[PDB]
Amino acid sequence: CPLMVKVLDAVRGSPAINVAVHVFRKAADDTWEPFASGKTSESGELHGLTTEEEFVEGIYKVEIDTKSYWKALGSSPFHEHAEVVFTANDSGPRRYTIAALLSPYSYSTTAVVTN
Amino acid sequence: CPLMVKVLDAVRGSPAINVAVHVFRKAADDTWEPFASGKTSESGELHGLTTEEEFVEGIYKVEIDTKSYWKALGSSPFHEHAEVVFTANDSGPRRYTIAALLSPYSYSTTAVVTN
Amino acid sequence: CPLMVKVLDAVRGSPAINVAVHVFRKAADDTWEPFASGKTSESGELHGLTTEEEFVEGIYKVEIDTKSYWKALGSSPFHEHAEVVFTANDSGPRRYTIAALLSPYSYSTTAVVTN
Amino acid sequence: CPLMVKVLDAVRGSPAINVAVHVFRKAADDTWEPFASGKTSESGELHGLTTEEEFVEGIYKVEIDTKSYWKALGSSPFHEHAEVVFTANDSGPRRYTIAALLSPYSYSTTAVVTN
């Protein structure tokens, strides 16, 4: 499992459960082509997205699409979408973990690359 | 000024200077149309991107080109850029400030929305 | 103004107003001595905490009372406060801005240091 | 294992290995008494800090003390110390995970409370 995604909720202090996550890979014409996707588990994780053979070097984008996730106050609803764009590089560690922390008007993301 | 961007560098503890910023607006056909762009000043701020008349209701994408910034400082960053998608002026005209905090393998973006 | 504090609210997308802030300086006997305190303005900023003469070299602790802030808004936060310890003016006098971003179960603090 | 701590490095994109972490519990006289401590593992985690019987309600502080951790540039070295103060509450989930993301002039922390 070369690519793992973990989503957390900064308002509730818990994993972000059952949230849709999409991964795209950039094509020669600069178009974003679907690569893998799924919904986070009860631990806020998404495993089995891809395989070592399929996850080659290139530019990828991880989009997190929350829907009716906050269900709370919010004058001027932001409808925020985390959009994490990175380059997969073979010259570094092989395992990638993309973590995202969500709030109504903010988000933070970190990459943990290991072997 | 209805749309401003401020960027900070967490490694050097300073404003992020001369960072390129691109703003897009989603079109009817679902494609991203260029809206405005510029570069941060010595204070890490970018003003004058648009006007009240031009900044209509819609879905916007703010892309901060962090890879170029880190590389210009001799670092090898993980992300291509720091990006956030949101809906603006859906409850009437508002002033938006997108504040970003950058590190080589992590970043955060927050929106300050006022009347 | 050599020491300023700015606080933002990630749930409401606005400055954090009327937040109490306490600053301490470590004494010779290893205890924390009160240094300065105040509350953020309508812009979420706190100026005039100290002067160049009073802000000597040392180890400082900035405590932002986030529990009181969240509770005053009807929320039940996780942390007692947002705190950070650092060494100031160890390379000569500098201007410091401590910027904090708050959510009920998470927070971040960053320092902008200029000449 | 009611209390777990995970530390990440935002500059290197990896777990923060072999870093000293201290946990204190506030006493009646408002003094901070040592409670548990250790050094992070190769996964940046610290398990076995305490037991369900020992981890009672109260105010706790998690201090992260990095030493010669950055070993890089840094005019006006911040010598930052993450200080996470929270109240353990029995009316909520039983398992606590305190996560911290470190940078030279900034840090972020989040609490994930589950059952």
Side-chain angles (χ1 to χ4, degrees):
Chain A
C1 198
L3 180 67
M4 313 177 128
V5 175
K6 186 179 182 60
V7 192
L8 300 179
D9 184 327
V11 177
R12 304 185 176 79
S14 70
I17 317 305
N18 198 49
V19 173
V21 180
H22 291 73
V23 186
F24 303 84
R25 184 170 182 289
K26 207 166 187 178
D29 49 59
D30 289 59
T31 294
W32 287 106
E33 190 178 306
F35 182 75
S37 59
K39 277 191 154 64
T40 58
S41 64
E42 291 196 300
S43 65
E45 306 186 70
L46 185 47
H47 295 73
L49 271 176
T50 185
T51 62
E52 58 182 2
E53 294 185 359
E54 176 178 288
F55 193 53
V56 296
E57 293 188 306
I59 299 176
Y60 294 81
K61 172 164 64 180
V62 178
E63 296 189 6
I64 294 67
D65 303 328
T66 60
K67 49 175 168 292
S68 304
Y69 187 73
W70 298 121
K71 306 195 67 176
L73 222 300
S75 304
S76 290
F78 213 49
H79 301 299
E80 179 186 66
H81 285 267
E83 309 278 350
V84 188
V85 185
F86 65 99
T87 291
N89 167 48
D90 281 354
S91 63
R94 292 63 205 176
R95 296 291 168 286
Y96 297 64
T97 292
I98 300 299
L101 178 70
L102 312 178
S103 292
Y105 292 83
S106 178
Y107 89 89
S108 57
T109 186
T110 310
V112 184
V113 191
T114 63
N115 282 304
Chain B
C1 197
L3 182 62
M4 313 179 278
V5 180
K6 189 172 179 62
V7 189
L8 299 180
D9 181 327
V11 174
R12 310 192 316 177
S14 68
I17 309 166
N18 287 310
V19 179
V21 178
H22 289 73
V23 185
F24 306 85
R25 181 177 179 285
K26 205 168 192 177
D29 52 34
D30 213 61
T31 63
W32 291 97
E33 191 68 52
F35 180 72
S37 59
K39 285 187 185 294
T40 59
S41 67
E42 300 294 345
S43 64
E45 310 182 311
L46 172 49
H47 300 75
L49 277 167
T50 188
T51 64
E52 52 191 0
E53 294 185 358
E54 283 292 279
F55 194 33
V56 297
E57 190 177 10
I59 298 178
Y60 293 78
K61 173 190 293 185
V62 173
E63 287 182 23
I64 296 69
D65 301 324
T66 59
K67 183 172 185 173
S68 183
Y69 174 75
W70 289 120
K71 280 184 163 55
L73 294 177
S75 302
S76 188
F78 180 77
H79 306 91
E80 281 295 304
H81 55 231
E83 169 175 345
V84 65
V85 169
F86 57 97
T87 301
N89 308 302
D90 39 299
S91 296
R94 295 289 184 291
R95 302 293 174 176
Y96 294 74
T97 290
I98 299 295
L101 178 63
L102 317 177
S103 290
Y105 282 73
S106 176
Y107 68 79
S108 70
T109 60
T110 312
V112 185
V113 187
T114 62
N115 247 78
Chain C
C1 197
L3 182 62
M4 313 179 278
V5 180
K6 189 172 179 62
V7 189
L8 299 180
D9 181 327
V11 174
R12 310 192 316 177
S14 68
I17 309 166
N18 287 310
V19 179
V21 178
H22 289 73
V23 185
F24 306 85
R25 181 177 179 285
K26 205 168 192 177
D29 52 34
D30 213 61
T31 63
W32 291 97
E33 191 68 52
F35 180 72
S37 59
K39 285 187 185 294
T40 59
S41 67
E42 300 294 345
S43 64
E45 310 182 311
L46 172 49
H47 300 75
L49 277 167
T50 188
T51 64
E52 52 191 0
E53 294 185 358
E54 283 292 279
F55 194 33
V56 297
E57 190 177 10
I59 298 178
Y60 293 78
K61 173 190 293 185
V62 173
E63 287 182 23
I64 296 69
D65 301 324
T66 59
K67 183 172 185 173
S68 183
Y69 174 75
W70 289 120
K71 280 184 163 55
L73 294 177
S75 302
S76 188
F78 180 77
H79 306 91
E80 281 295 304
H81 55 231
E83 169 175 345
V84 65
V85 169
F86 57 97
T87 301
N89 308 302
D90 39 299
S91 296
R94 295 289 184 291
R95 302 293 174 176
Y96 294 74
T97 290
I98 299 295
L101 178 63
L102 317 177
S103 290
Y105 282 73
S106 176
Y107 68 79
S108 70
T109 60
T110 312
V112 185
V113 187
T114 62
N115 247 78
Chain D
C1 198
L3 180 67
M4 313 177 128
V5 175
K6 186 179 182 60
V7 192
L8 300 179
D9 184 327
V11 177
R12 304 185 176 79
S14 70
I17 317 305
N18 198 49
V19 173
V21 180
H22 291 73
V23 186
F24 303 84
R25 184 170 182 289
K26 207 166 187 178
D29 49 59
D30 289 59
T31 294
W32 287 106
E33 190 178 306
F35 182 75
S37 59
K39 277 191 154 64
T40 58
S41 64
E42 291 196 300
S43 65
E45 306 186 70
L46 185 47
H47 295 73
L49 271 176
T50 185
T51 62
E52 58 182 2
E53 294 185 359
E54 176 178 288
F55 193 53
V56 296
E57 293 188 306
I59 299 176
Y60 294 81
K61 172 164 64 180
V62 178
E63 296 189 6
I64 294 67
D65 303 328
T66 60
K67 49 175 168 292
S68 304
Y69 187 73
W70 298 121
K71 306 195 67 176
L73 222 300
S75 304
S76 290
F78 213 49
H79 301 299
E80 179 186 66
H81 285 267
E83 309 278 350
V84 188
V85 185
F86 65 99
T87 291
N89 167 48
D90 281 354
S91 63
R94 292 63 205 176
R95 296 291 168 286
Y96 297 64
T97 292
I98 300 299
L101 178 70
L102 312 178
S103 292
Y105 292 83
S106 178
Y107 89 89
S108 57
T109 186
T110 310
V112 184
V113 191
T114 63
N115 282 304

